[model samples]
Target chain A: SGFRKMAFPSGKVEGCMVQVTCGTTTLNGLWLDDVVYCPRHVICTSEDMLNPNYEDLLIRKSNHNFLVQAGNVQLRVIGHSMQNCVLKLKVDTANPKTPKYKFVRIQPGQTFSVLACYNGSPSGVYQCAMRPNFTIKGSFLNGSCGSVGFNIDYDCVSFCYMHHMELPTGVHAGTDLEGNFYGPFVDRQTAQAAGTDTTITVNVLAWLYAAVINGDRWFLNRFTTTLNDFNLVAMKYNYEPLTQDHVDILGPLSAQTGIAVLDMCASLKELLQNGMNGRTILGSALLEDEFTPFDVVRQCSGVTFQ
Target chain B: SGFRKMAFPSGKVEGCMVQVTCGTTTLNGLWLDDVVYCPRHVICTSEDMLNPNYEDLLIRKSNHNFLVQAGNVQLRVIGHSMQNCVLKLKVDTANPKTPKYKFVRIQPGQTFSVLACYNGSPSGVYQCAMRPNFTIKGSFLNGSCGSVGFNIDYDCVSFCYMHHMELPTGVHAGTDLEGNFYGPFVDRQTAQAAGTDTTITVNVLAWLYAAVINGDRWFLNRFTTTLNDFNLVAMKYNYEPLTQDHVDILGPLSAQTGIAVLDMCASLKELLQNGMNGRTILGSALLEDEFTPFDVVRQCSGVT
Candidate 1:
């Protein structure tokens, strides 16, 4: 597996001189995602850019949790240029026949950083699958040139992509799970968190995995991780905000008590492979490529598999 | 009306000298309601106490127009011996069978003035009508003699009595024809009519009335009236702070609008009676004997 480390600086004053280094890696078929650099303390979200797939870039006063500012990625092109010189933006989520590419025109030797806007592209993980064969393809397309500098901005852009449905209002006195049209039974403060905060909760971990398998971009990274972000587990997806398919699978099953019985059979298989609790794997081994099995006690004891 | 006018030097200074002479053929009931009075101004009410019927008491203050301080009768009782007498007071407005009254035991013939408090006693005039009788009965039963002199306090009292209902957080604004609660409105300029530079807004009317109708019997006419000693409508009733009935009547009405409408009606009646458009008719023969069709208008105008 390949990984890259993005450095986060503590504090930088506005209008003050600061040094930033450009490219440190070289490779062919490279499509540079947008990057955001703030002078001092800037917190950036994907909504601020022309592109929206990137991560959030937050900068704040030195060592303080409070954010000073944020940044977003937006791409702007200036002149008429060649086709082969630019990286094509594509979306391959649920469509099979739809064109998977958009051509960007750029001058032969011109180098530019392309940032994604929050609303510009359809949502899905953009993998660098086919890095264009620049040699033969580049020469045949337009005026050819020698060496070109491709600078990629690694600054993360954070944004809220999905619209959440508003929950109702009522008094929740606690000591029960009974809720109103707007709620889970709890106090006002907790009810608000359940209604409007995160999208997942202990109630629906299976659908989240199903979403991940179906190439839902937001669930990809978390489903693959070691599961440290339990805040995501404590989240409750608002059925009102979801599509019909999502409602069909998880809506009815969710209203039932306890999270144990609600995990999808396929999800349990994946969880078993990921080293979930032993009892979750009732029966399995139904895929083309049988993955790893649950190590049970070792996995539960916080051991990672090789 | 035996009326004599005495002029005090400054416009109503505290402790100003009051000269009393026979204002009419007789001056028998001219006792001060409160211990505090300005020299030379005589007290009068439109209720025609000789007839003993309730009438809204009106006093004309410049820039303020004629003001209605009480619905029917304006009575204030202030006793010089109030400070000396200790009172145990019980009040109720829930039932008519048991009249609400204040009990005070006064020493000999210490002077006391009766302040009228009936800005718009909307629980029907029956409340005020029953109140005086109850008060006298309570006093006599509690050992107060008929010798206790009762005078009038000029400031108008809170006309609207409200209870648990939503009322103007402060005082009665006014009344309308339908007997609705109204008003948090106030006459800001005229409130300072005394020139002592004191504000005499409707809330002040409530306090002055509270001293009497609610029975803090110590309020005595200590001083006399002066030219600045303007007339204020006042009353004495037997009740506690705020009763539930007060809320039911006053809580649901627009006090400001009612007060304005009643004020206009007061003006019209004053126009017909005294030929003054803006003057308030505190007492009028029209309201005295069996509210004539017009008197019905007056009662409804004063309360609703």
Candidate 2:
């Protein structure tokens, strides 16, 4: 027998998309080399290629395909291997080709832990893959091995992004490939500063744009509440209106992709004029760009803009 | 006799002065040749020189001295003279020495009618006098024979000026010596017309000015209401703003009378800027002169 089956614990599994390697050979879609002919037909088995404890080895990975506990925002990982195995986790699988992985060494037991990938993206479905040294085989589980499958949805990252980033509840989060937070920055200057990728910034801007343009009252309320906080921070920081720096970062992406930030500002302005139930949203949108920020402040100061 | 005592009806007799004449002599502060002796004193009597029927003579004058019947805006005159006496009424007593008087002759008995003097001058009082071949004396009354004396006040001509000229009520009236109406004219051009006396026009302007600047709510309301009407008329007439013609009429008055219409316009503008309740008054004033009437109209037209 190549490997003996190991029973999973009655807890959660932490990740999705498992990969196992034994010695120099890697267990993949390709079958084992050794083939045997039975009395009825020929049977090809991966026993010779896989590790002796392949069925007993377990690994947990983060991102999409990972199962989350229903009540608590936690992931699960079950380890069935006799010896310890190193598991690498990638929180943001936004770009699958170059994934930023965080590694953890697990013993021969099931362990559930919160991973950065759990709260990384506004889209709760985190795309992730796990890599282990020993060959392992596993099936996806909702929380425990015997339970149903877990569906990644808005709720997955709803509280995760809000709680971890200290954002108002219900506000969606946006981050770069390396898991650096970008959406609803403390201030515009902070978002414009270095270390924040321009592409991520554009993504964050697009996310906020859609939230305002297409979101319902509930979504708007949360987004606007967060925006209000950002405005206060900007006001404290003496932030000027959006400038060339902002346009420069936003322009290239807009040219490459048809979603221009200026056009979004215009749309936001129109939507604000159309009367959103959230005045705060209107105020935030008005104060977002240069064209109307001064006027917005003037109006707030009681001098109606002519 | 110098003069004969005559009875007066009830109420107050308005107007400031009265005059009487007999024969070739005009009886004023002067006395006749008749003298009476009473033990320790000698008294001169006017009864003998006066006509025997002087007690029945009654003359109705105009301006301030004219008596108005209660509950009606009409003038009353009971001509009780034995013969016809010429009763003269001067509309404006502003200059009493050369008064503008309209004379009417009446015989004995009562004659009740409306007089043009009733609607004359911003001040209700009219200066009047009566002349006959015999000496006669009479006192003014309010309405009836036994009522209190009529006091000529700003209210007397207040209604007269407003009603006869179709002006808003409570605004004082201003009239020429001939009792021609002027005050809160239908429009600036109309007030600027030749038939309207420049002096009376100035008086009307001054009256409106004071109404806006110093008068209370009652006066301001009426003045502003009329001003609003004037503004409407000006707008309809396509009235231009303050021109040299307006300055011509107002300039001389301002020079002669220490009140400058320009300064008044400034004050009115400031007041209007302070609030919009007085906008109609400001509109009228601006339309009266050209300083900012066009802009005012434009602002009113919603170009703002």
Candidate 3:
């Protein structure tokens, strides 16, 4: 009886005629059609958390999971105190027709990355997609081009931030598949300041992808067949910058984790704020990625390397 | 001409007839209607980054912002080598007929939080929304509910992780304001496992809200007018757990940053894997909240 765009437990209300309540129970999240409506937005149907059509949510509570009743649907409950469940909308099709809502699992006041490419654009326009699982998290349009690139404007967050120096420039924001929204980068340049570093916590992959096009873009080119022209090199704390005496440092060409500091980028002394004693990771310069074996011969550790 | 749901530079392609692309510039993010479509999503109009209708995105690129083309619109940039432009669909309405999508700024494979409540519930059902800036970033569904609550599943990430011990259970996922998605918690309970800790760092706010209902929920609250029974407490290393000797360490109830450890939830020894050395927060059993200043007398530190 309401707008035809409302949601259904088994499907959406599109193309269907006016639907009615199941007669007795409305809070059951269901309809006479045996479908259920969401408690929050009754216009849509509430699905089972385990339904194969929706994405899986990240579990954070240690003991149990809880949710309001769905149309006879319940999230999976594991062990004694552990119950797992959450609400999710229908997945976006290879191409969707109706307006759909995708959920991102990120909290607000945090910073993250987006991924875009000009690799195979028929129009030669640089477009961005959601990072990691590459998809648009926002409402969809048939001929819509999800925004891509970075937000390089300076805000208080950039005051002491050194990680964002690698992201791509000239980008727009886009949503993610999980309920969060983000954008990726194109080349290295002055980018947008997400927020305070204390709150943002750098998004490594976001930096890594954009790093592929910046000043020292070659630092992460693990697949480059030839010797890369890595422009970043580290020097001792008080020494002259970039000398011939400086050693040529490197990282794993096979590693995927984003490298924060390269030999050419920040010097070991520069990255490490309290490295006088050096027992801790006071700082790392061109450190080894976890999967790759640790190599310190080329770039020797100063205070000492165990 | 395509789907009737295309976005307008100022509005949508609904009710009004469709506007064709401005002849001379197809790449421009605008339609002949003087509105722009996002290059990535041509069905939606591209907008000026400086436009008043959109949310300010978190800039991660250190240098500048860039985009393909908008309806004769260029993002207003303020510096050298810094270009700012991106594609954004129009803002959502209080209630709408066509679907609209929202953006969240979080990346994939990372962990974050959501917020929800039963407060003032005309219907006693719990619902969640995005954290920090409370809003939804997903497609609009009239009368649709944004899910709330926590995902408390024990995945590989929680194997050795400690912080998530405080979150709510039984929640649904929801999107955030920016280009990301998220959900909040109702009370503390078992949750769905978000990847691993090393990769999925704990989201402070996510755990905080859910902590409000769990066993040691009182650790984060500071407004209890009296000598409230703070369930958690900490003691020195190698000491027997929870003796009267153990100090009732505390944090500011006023502080909002997510508190990972509480004296009662896990003993000082349990939170800190290593105490052989004196320094380092290898473990924290109720530390001080930053904004409230330090009050060390309630909970003393160290094996010294």
Candidate 4:
């Protein structure tokens, strides 16, 4: 069975179920498919969910043809006065090269849909670049000393761009009815579904950051190119029609282009608190490696198409 | 007045004292010359003393010459809990182009020294990099929708390196002397007082794992170049000489290196807790933003 398409449910806790479509390719006789769903549920009780919520879904596909879909599948309750909760989600794809995805913070009872791929092209995985708040382990005293805990509240914050291949249909080249740039990071399904001669481009940027102790900071800004933008082209402000049911099901196409700019500012308050506590923690815990009391609420987000 | 080299006191606080050293360039008149030191301090609390039981001492010059001895001195603290404290000490050298000398992180209390160079070959201040732990603020939704507060603990932990452009005396080709390796990182430096080679090379590796609610489980690995090995060459087997004075001044050398590694493990546990709590704060306070609660923690070990 060459990799055929798959259809899964968006298992939203609100009893609203959405169908997710996944693409596939052929390799020998075995269908080299991707995983698009998880067997559990992801619960979000915390309030500080970001753009890509941890419960956000991902389509995991290995070369072996097993399709694993994971995202806000199960919500676990570890018990700590509801102020803290430990979450766990599983991904079940084929053997070897297990497909995995990254997540961001999300609030409880909030619903979000992660496209994962814009249109068969990996174009989004939120990442940001920030200087590390402190260095743990790797001192001159302990030859093999190592550090594991980290408080992300005080690190420098910046907008991250997510880029990758094998996402979904992406916006390549399209002009709005008014002759404006229309398709660069847009999803394909929306373009095609918009039954009209007018075409527009869509783009998504996911920012990510990484740093080393007593080391430099690096970021993984991920985005996609015009790989799978299979849709109509036209100028801006042109009315294109797909269908009532299609519109109701897929809803308005959300490219998430200007979303980061909004998020960049929204994260300020959180940054301030982290800064205040970082000073205190460093003063009291000198030479000790432990998580700061302020880092109790850090989280990540994710997205998937359903 | 010219660039005068100065010796470092055994015990010094991060931002306590300011010193100056003479470099190759001869000062014409009474022009000001300054130096920056990464001072180390010992937190000694006897069973009797009440407050202020700790004492800070100047250990060494983290970087070479570029300063105005008494005119301009700036100190900036950066880092997280349980690690070395990074004090960004800056001083003016009267010369605009070569305005100052900035010292990197100085351990708690230890005997360390610094050298100077004036001929302005690799001219300019040396810039080093280090990563510290983080303190979270705001909700994930707030971050996604706007800005997030990410504070740093400037006292407990710090990691940074120095860059030089001169070669001090006693450094020959393939001498196998530990301190000689720093010659590659530095170009020129005045010969030691007794010409006893002083420099070492020690490289460190650190791993970071995402502990964000909905964070990734994979490890982020980073490595250091051989240039940073100068400190090791200077200490020989006695990497962490500060341990004897103040346990808090756990140097990142010799026996203390292992302790640093253990401290990192503890930091990871704290990261996990932060992830969980950060999610809660986001979900509750920043309800409009909508934060997620998926945390990740990474395991660490030495390589090679």
Candidate 5:
């Protein structure tokens, strides 16, 4: 048996329990029995706690896996075996010349927090990832072992334009439309459950209308391209009835594109509303059907673009 | 003729009288009469006041001479002729090794004063002499002439001793003697009026006594030598009586010796009288013949 014998060394060992197994013999709480034969042989070992090969044994003893939060990067170590482990957090952003790295020691069932990266260009993209590694007394316990990596995306103030697009005469492009431009639509799950061409067409048309008037070419271009791709595939599929999976994929895409469209549309709506409160809108009559998107773009371009 | 004719260019001079003199002919306050019928000729000149030849004319026109006071030396020009004359005064003293000179102008009937010399050693002798010299425009009136020097002696505090004398044993000499000097007696007129041997001997003896007690050997030697000379001649004349002329020769000596003795006697008398008011004679017994001069000197020396 690999287990070694242990003893209480003094006094009655009442209420003390040990679980032991060797070959075919098994023992459970044997110290709780009252017997006069004094010499005892008890087996005890905790080597499995230090060994990842016994991950199943470690997980059964531990409580939960590691958890992460974005915005302000935070780590929660939830398993008993996670004690004495190091959480390494890395934050990457395009604007800064270098990525930032931070390390924190988290005991079992403990949470560690770090400040979010605020330096860098506004509307720049950034990502944070946290990984756990076994360490004891500042040295890796299992040098070859690897742990799962958790990641999150963060936008520094607004979405950054990945590419510059030149729009045609009547088109506009915009990005970052999550709340300011459009919102309060049917939930993704509800929409997929009750998928209808009318609702989808209305939403897409609303989004496109927002992107056109706001003059946000960045989002407008991306929205147009993504929609074009979707239509081309639909055409290839013979325009068959789309499934929930197709709609599910469109959930995030629509959500993202919907936000961009809503941002541009809301900004224009606010400007028009505020214009009524102070100065009268120039050529207020042009807002009639006679003034088209081309006219709007030409008029907007005349005002000067940053 | 006792008078001369005088006239002004205008006409016959009136109310003017001149005194003139010709050889054996003198005129007083006379103007010429019946002798001047043509135009008059006149000669007039006024020379420098200090020119001696012009002195007579100036004096005839002006009044008196310059008078001076000795101490705080002052000068009063009494005559009109001395007007515009400068009185230069110089003072010399033994100490300070310098002579002081002052010049003051005396107009007609004006007086000038100068401060006396007081800065020097006490008992130092000083002499200030004033001479009349010419100055013009407040300069000497007599450009080249000098008047007779007038001198005055000032003792800064007391008279300075001009000579020192050493005396033999038992002899002393004193010049200015109120207390510590010698003497001689008899007025010069009396000594010369009745030159008798007895009178002379009495006076000589009195002088010798004073000389001995007053420690004035200087005057004593001179007095004795003069008497010896007188006696040797008297003996040559077979002890004839001395004449008034001979006595008159002793006038200066008598005067000098008399003053010395008087000074010494006066000082001693004053001291003794003052002594009586405060301290008694230390050895009154010595006043009886037991006290010789040497013993008195000794006792006086011993009182300490």
Candidate 6:
């Protein structure tokens, strides 16, 4: 058998019969693999979200494997059986004289994030300096045993170029896609038959923040990553995909690259009321924590992801 | 009785025979009203901790009833029994034209903080705009019913003009000053008789941060504000004192007055590791909460 290639597959929210309203328009939204179909104008405030041109975007990325990047910072995804990976970083920390090029190990369920404060001097490369407001929260679930793909939000609110990664193909859903669905929701067989790819989003931070608010911690905890070793590979944009166990970057950022922070602490409650419209996203509802989210909403209101 | 006046008292951390150690230094630091005396330089990162000039600072504020101000923002204190207070704020918040001159109420247990983002419109004032790095955290046990003195940390890390407030006689202690001291520690009569104000601190933000890490919920909860009712007063730095239940002021800061925030989110663990050196403060030991403190120690790592 030949090595059949496929872009990472997205999951579906089967049996989602619940109705959603958008301004005067109202309808239900379901998933076809990674693409979500709404009743025309549900998440229509931005036409980009509605007619996302996902097929074209998916095609652009279809040939590529799981890895996207901005700066020398490369994000590689793993989609196979068990094997621990590493983040081979090469950047100056607080001092440029001693650049830390360490291979930080990565296992299932563990997520790590990096935010660059523009204060580094001399050899001027974006490193993990400190400032507030430019808040970068890691994903709730880093990766799983089968689809080794996970997300990483590298502290960006546009200006800082916050990098993000998730299991491509489909985002997370309240209902598991691999398993079966019952009662009100449609199963994958019917969903695959009925739906088609219309829109897919790689925007990681937006979904991550929503997860902080809406996720059900208990349900999420059940899906925590476990080691079940298998073959996995890593990739860097433009470069030939490499089958390595680590993501190596040579700190290629200077004034040419970019940065985000906090008064930035307006109030997440304000955001839920305003930006997010108070409705929890489907994926975050499955992965959210408790009261701390209230604290995040109440305190982290000022960080502008919009 | 010649209107018997007192510089605000500091509470005692009585009953704390639990030994603490410094780089070879050791022993207890207990209270006399509001002063804690270490055997030597237990908190000796700086010499000021050993021989802090308390008598001088107390004399500086002895005459003042209960109001301290930095810029136009004045903090007032109430001692007697009842009566609600308010923060009559007058600064541009995001916008300067219609400067918000609102009086926010301050009942028992309610603590409000103002951190100037140094981002204001015209009028050249430090209004509550927005910035990261300048992390300003409020206090835990704001004020109780009996002695209506609270602490407000106006977002300062020296660079910005961070103003602080407390029941200024003595800083908060592990044990209550107004009540009796049972068990291992000395009582007020013995502590006062054995003690003198060797040193007192007005450093509000430092003490407040320690409180977040140390406080004991059950005991601290017992002292929530009750509001029995009495006369309270407010004051400004230079101007004559104003005796009112509420504080009123106009925004009078330009490029002068200052501000603090996050990356800035350097791990408090790193802080507990380096700066604070991990040990919980006496007052905070009485007011500390649970697991969320762990989260604060974790997520807030990068903010500083």
Q: What is the C-alpha RMSD of each candidate to the true structure, in Å?
A: 37.0, 43.2, 23.5, 26.3, 70.3, 25.9
CAPRI docking class of candidate 6? incorrect
- Give the 10-residue window scoring lowest on summed lDDT in candidate 2 chain B: B35-44
Off by over 4 Å in 1: A1-196, A200-243, A247-306, B1-304
The digit string of per-residue lDDT tens for model 5 on A188-208 reads: 112212111111222222323
Q: Is the docking of candidate 5 incorrect, acceptable, medium or high quality?
A: incorrect
Q: Cα lDDT for residue B145, model 5?
A: 15
TM-score for candidate 4, please give it.
0.18
Model 2 per-residue lDDT tens digits across residues A70-176: 22233232221111111222222222221222222221111111211111111011111111111111111111111111211211311111011211221222222
TM-score of 1: 0.12
Q: At residue A47, what lDDT does model 1 achieve?
A: 41
Candidate 1 lDDT over B174-241, as tens digits, reads: 11111221222221212311111122122222222222222222322323322111122111111122
Query: lDDT tens string, model 6, B15-130?
Result: 11122233433333211122222222222334444344433422333212222222243323222111111111121121111111221222111221121111010000111101
lDDT of each: 0.19, 0.23, 0.21, 0.19, 0.20, 0.20
Quick one: best TM-score, which candidate? 3
Q: Which segments of model 6 are wrong by more than 4 Å?
A: A1-51, A55-306, B1-51, B55-304
Poorly placed runs, candidate 5 (over 4 Å): A1-306, B1-57, B60-210, B215-304
Q: What is the lDDT of residue B31 in candidate 2?
A: 7
Per-residue CA lDDT of candidate 5, range B15-126, in tens?
1112221122222111112110100000002222123333353334421222222223332323222212211112121112112222222211111111111111011011
CA displacement after TM-score superposition, residue A301 of candidate 1 (Å): 28
The model with the greatest lDDT is 2
- List the candidates' TM-scores in order: 0.12, 0.15, 0.20, 0.18, 0.12, 0.18
Alpha carbon lDDT of residue A198, candidate 2? 12
Q: Which portions of model 2 miss their true places by more than 4 Å?
A: A1-306, B1-233, B237-245, B252-304
**Where is model 3 more than 4 Å wrong at Cα?**
A1-262, A265-306, B1-262, B265-304
